[PDB]
UniProtKB/Swiss-Prot annotation, chains A, B, C, D:
It holds the Pfam family Linocin_M18. This is Type 1 encapsulin shell protein EncA. It comes from the Bacteria. The gene is encA. Shell component of a type 1, iron-storage encapsulin nanocompartment. Encapsulin nanocompartments are 32 nm in diameter with an iron- and phosphorus-rich core (4Fe:1P) about 24 nm in diameter. Upon expression in E.coli most particles are 32 nm, 20% are 18 nm. The core is filled with an average of 14 dense granules, 5-6 nm in diameter that are not evenly distributed. Each nanocompartment is estimated to hold 30,000-35,000 Fe atoms. The minor proteins EncB, EncC and EncD probably lie against the interior face of the nanocompartment.
């Protein structure tokens, strides 16, 4: 039975691994920032604060007191809860029928949307900054995208001004849906991907007529992931089984002038 | 100790088996419908819906689409909660003294009363029907039971009219307490048990001056039991241990004209 | 799978044995003639004709030709068909859930009703006789059963006249429902069971205000059962599985004056 | 010989596996909904009903009765019959020559056409809904597709309105042949595949000047496949061998506002 008491493990090893791979594949399919940002590895669930800066480095009958000049920030956690019926779990095992993980997929999609929202825009009340709200970014006037080549000229101007401060490298462009739906002239996206070697992507979190061009590289910006998106058991409730899809991560912008918004 | 942390199993194997047999014996002692109904086996906790009908059975350059004409209904669950103190459980094991299962017995009795109520009368809002509320039943005018033989004549009339549609077989009679308390003439119940071979029983769920005669048989009516009455651990609360006596079952009336109410 | 082709055995050994025991128990619960008749054993499915009489027993330059004076009669077969869905059988095995045998139970009940009808009344067009239609039976005028002891006096008269031809022995009485529903005076059935040692039974096949008293014994009447009631597979149809509950048996009345109808 | 009697298996293992792979490849080549829908696994032939909703989740001297609020629907079966001559099967084995499976291929193609018809349009008499007939779908006025970019603008409007309710994600567009034959301006399909990441497909079941855009994901819509398309033996007829290509599946639309028809 295994349903007549509180359980350490309500699902079998294969059921947990089908819940985890579904969560991971939904996250990979719905996340856009992981394709333009470098990951500072999976640090571990025990890591709570990370340095937001780079380490620079620095007696007469008195000892010296050395304190790190680097600033530290705590890693936020984004989570979403869902529930599984116990009779459905009993049906998976005794009938030998697959388990439905639609609730887990929906929770993972919502958590991945929240992650991209946090990456592109910060919070302004917990101290977190985003790519579109960082201080020091380079901002270029927008141009008429309806004309053939207006978006190309805007990207050229953005690239040139981002170059003028010593940031070149492969470039990555992320555009709002309202800008992305104006590239209908033909293969006009392919003549912007030749200036953006890392890629041109569409982000639904971007609001209004806005886009961003970033000079990629670990020296400019990282995504410190304390723990990757995963599903965890919150303990049985009233015979039913609640689970939580959670991920802990932070965005570190070390060179705020490597970002150029439109 | 085993009380200093959350537990998979707060009771020992013998304690669980003394809780389960007490629940089963209370259910058997307090249930009347299991003596007049045939059980469609213990289907399992994974079974959630069952067919309410019997399977009857049923190209030109086009494939055919076959859908079952049988109707399906979901199996209801009846449950009752009780609580066990942790110090009392510690006293069972360390003092080697029996455990008190009075709360479990009371919960089982309440759940068995609810089961009989659901069997005899449906719900009318969740779609469930009962023996006294089914459409198509055969209803006979009642007679004066105070006179000697009035109940016998009522049962004879009920039997004859139930016969007139091809339903004979061993007959089972279930009477309300107010009808059962009117058989004081002597061994008058024993001259009705000779017409009802399956038995004459008393049911406290029956309301008013009412009774029922059923032509027993799997072809006429079944009691699909997804899972038998059992006690399950709902997880530790604040050091204390809540348990739930639960049973999942449904009543299937396939020949509604095999039932005759008084 | 085992459902992707025509099958020798659609059910497992345990499924066949649960179909067979259900058929047998329904037959035993619904048959009344097997309690008053002696069985001439299970002869076998290969037996088609049986002698209807008892063997009594019976040269000048010419051989003699001996032909048995016993008459022979062919054993009738009573059958009823039902159907099982293939998806339900697949659900029994893969889900490990019990199989529903309600159709088999209904077919067995109908076949058992037909058997009792054939036993009590013959056919008159295939040559078969019954207990209530045999030539030579002893018939006694009926009496008013409403009066206290009228049925007892009728049975006494029947017993005395059945005695007057050398037939005593344990007596067996079978009454119609309309006669059986007139024994409400009290334990009046128990004062007739003291004259009928084999038993007083109720038969729904008997029509009108009629009953029968038989002097039991193999020398007077037998029930030759070529094959007992059993379920057989008629071969797959269109993915679905038809089965047949069948029984082959005949009633042999060797002393027609050992039967007394009311 | 093996043709002189009824057979469990008229074909050899390799012949069955060449009949099954041909059926599967025809289904894969002729099915379009399996490329835009997520499959709720092969549940098994024993599964007959599935929940059409998502599980949400929910004493005083009285037990509580809990009934699932989820609605259940039965899984339809689509089948097509074909026939194989016995002399042709004998020729496959004794001559060691390949077997012709053209009839199986045709039956699989017809069954796959019926599956797509059922997916896109329901039945309206058995309770099944489709992508083009669901209640709650988002419907956008159509535009002149002859003009260069009219289809692109229609898809942009559909995407924006489907976005306005919280459904973004990879988008999948399915168009009727009469709409698909109007993309002759050049690589205009490739500038709509940049807004539909899951793909733009053509469906012959769509009628008139109609198309659909769906926000893919298990949380929005699934295709519960009880059993995949397979060929089964219906039993020998008159020396000849009939087979049936059958598939049991249902479409589950849990978020009807994730669908936008043109």
């Amino acid at each position: 039975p295994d349903f007549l008491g509180h359980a350490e493990n309500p699902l079998r090893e294969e059921e947990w691994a089908r819940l985890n791979e579904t969560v991971i594949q939904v996250a990979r399919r719905s996340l856009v920032g992981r394709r333009i940002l470098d990951i500072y590895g999976p640090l571990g669930a025990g890591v709570q604060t990370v340095p937001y800066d780079e380490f620079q480095g620095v007696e007469q009958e008195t000892a010296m007191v050395f304190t790190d000049a680097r600033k530290f920030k705590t890693i936020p956690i984004i989570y979403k809860d869902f529930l599984l019926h116990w009779r459905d779990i009993e049906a998976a095992r005794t009938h030998n029928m697959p388990l439905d993980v639609s609730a887990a997929a929906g929770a993972a999609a919502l958590c991945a949307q929240q992650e991209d929202e946090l990456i592109f825009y910060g919070d302004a009340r917990l101290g977190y900054e985003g790519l579109m709200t960082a201080n020091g970014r380079l901002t270029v006037p927008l141009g008429d995208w309806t004309s053939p080549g207006g978006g190309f000229q805007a990207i050229v101007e953005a690239t040139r001004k981002l170059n003028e401060q010593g940031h070149f490298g492969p470039y990555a462009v992320v555009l709002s849906p309202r800008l992305y739906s104006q590239l209908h002239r033909g293969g006009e996206i392919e003549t912007i991907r030749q200036l953006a070697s890392d890629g041109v992507y569409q982000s639904n979190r971007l609001r209004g007529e806005s886009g961003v061009v970033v000079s990629t590289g670990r020296e400019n910006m990282d995504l410190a992931v304390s723990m990757d998106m995963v599903a965890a058991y919150l303990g049985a409730s009233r015979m039913n089984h609640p689970f939580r899809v959670l991920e802990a991560l932070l965005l570190r912008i070390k060179h705020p002038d490597a970002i150029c918004t439109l």
